[PDB]
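Can't attach files on this board, so I'm pasting raw text. These are the components:
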Amino acid sequence: TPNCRVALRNDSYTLHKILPNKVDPLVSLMMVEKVPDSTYEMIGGLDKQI
Amino acid sequence: EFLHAQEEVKRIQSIPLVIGQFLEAVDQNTAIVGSTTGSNYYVRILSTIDRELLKPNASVALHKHSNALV
Amino acid sequence: AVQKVVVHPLVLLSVVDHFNRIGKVGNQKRVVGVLLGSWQKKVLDVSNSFAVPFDEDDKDDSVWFLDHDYLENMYGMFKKVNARERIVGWYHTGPKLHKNDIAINELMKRYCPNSVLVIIDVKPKDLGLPTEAYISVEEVHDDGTPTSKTFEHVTSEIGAEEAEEVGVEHLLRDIKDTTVGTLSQRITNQVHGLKGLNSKLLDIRSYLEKVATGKLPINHQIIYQLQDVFNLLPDVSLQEFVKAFYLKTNDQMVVVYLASLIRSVVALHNLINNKIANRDAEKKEG
Amino acid sequence: AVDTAEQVYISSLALLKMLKHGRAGVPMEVMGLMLGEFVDDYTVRVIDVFAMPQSGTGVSVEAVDPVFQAKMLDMLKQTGRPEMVVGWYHSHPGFGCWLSGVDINTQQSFEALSERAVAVVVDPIQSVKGKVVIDAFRLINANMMVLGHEPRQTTSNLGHLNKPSIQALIHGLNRHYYSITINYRKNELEQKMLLNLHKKSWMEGLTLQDYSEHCKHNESVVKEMLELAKNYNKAVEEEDKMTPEQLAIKNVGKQDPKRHLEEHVDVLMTSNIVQCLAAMLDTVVFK
Ligand SMILES: [Zn+2]
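---
Top answer:
Structure tokens for the assembled complex are below.
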């Protein structure tokens, strides 16, 4: 696979397992994982821009 | 023997731990962590830690030799 | 001035095998060897030892043989392989100790000034006795008394460092007297903690039997030093009375309503969780 | 006339000399000898171990001092017991156990002089918790290249004691040397004197730790046990059909309903009974 990491046995260097989840360092605030902060109706007066 | 098991699980963590940072979680009880020695690793993790503290990122404690999450 | 000695468990251990080395020709019933040490503070430390040829005669009990030349060279070996360690004294066994120990000690105080000796007990190993250690001082005896030697005692203990508990914990593997105890473990500590109470007391029983009956000459020091013990035990009173039920009840309340009730309700929760899951698999078999 | 699945007996007094002397010189790969008796064909015992003075070379044939050899042997003849040397050992701190290239040459020297001359490798800094990384080995010939190396035979205790570990078979296992099993010449009167003398307390068995911290600790548990009881209220009055075998498994957390429950009830029970029972006995015994 592209950018595929594998689990490598540290003695003899044999492929232990295909590792999933290709490299994503510092993606923390990316994909926020909690949305509900304000709703669609509580804006008011900006209908054309919406 | 059940009390021998809980003791030996308990005294694997009171040690001079090294500190790396949690990187990614594959599945149940195994994950990717990168040390602050460099040289990113892939080790087993415990059954003690509630898994909701490993969000993408946390400084974590690691054994020297077995290198597992502690 | 010695606070206490620290017995590393290789030394006793290395006495018992050497008693077993001569045991195939065993007719001596005592083993004398050299006790290496590491003097740090008023507390003493022992971590190594070896043995030396020694003999003793029952007749006249004053013809005895420490070997100086064997003590010179083999200590020169252990100094060469480890310059941390030096001599601190010597050991023997056979708890009814021979009175020759004045002569053994006063010889090898020219190797260590504050020399010290430890008695191990290879065969008596049952009730309450790990080891015993003495210290050598010499007063005259007392104010208006003749001269004497009078070995004095310093308390002892068995020590523990890392990479010998590793050797200990790998060698027990059977019952181990497991970590922090249960109800049964604490009660046995009260049992054989009390089985030695009368055991020390049956010894002090027999002493003032055989000294007050009229056999051996009385010490005076031990008599009044025993006297204040009897005028120090507490008695029962009203102040002991109302206080004891003030805090026995306070210990009791924690047991009664907080431990017995809540453990019952948890087991009562396991009733309904079982009986629901029992019959709902029963009525839904077919 | 060839090797089997043998057995190595080490004494209890040997093992403490091993990993104390290894822990003493933890950076610098300490060295010592191994003194026992070849008792038959395929068992061996060792009773005694003495160390060696350390040279600038390290673990090799040159660190074996022949004048320290015969003088140390001489003064063990008249005191204790004289016996034959049966091998040697050294310490490998940074890794578990395998014979190095300098380790394999000094093994050739002793196996040419002696019968088999079993080596021992001890890692002191890995052997910490409750297990010891000690292993013993023996050099195998190249003449049996057309035959079965490790010439083992009629027994079923080869698959025990270790499978050949991956960190050790990457080195000369199993085509330069073979492993050999270790159990302990363990006996009574040494077992009980090490049990009863390292962990014992006589007059401590009826002490009190009296009440200023004991009854204080009776507050120290009940308070969060109150709040944890309110958390126990929460899950039980919840009781919804959210597929309750799935609802119980998706919230395992070493948490409230039974795990963080009566465990505290046990500790409150054991502390107070042993306190109050020892209190009533001291009134009984002392007048
Ligand atoms: Zn080596």
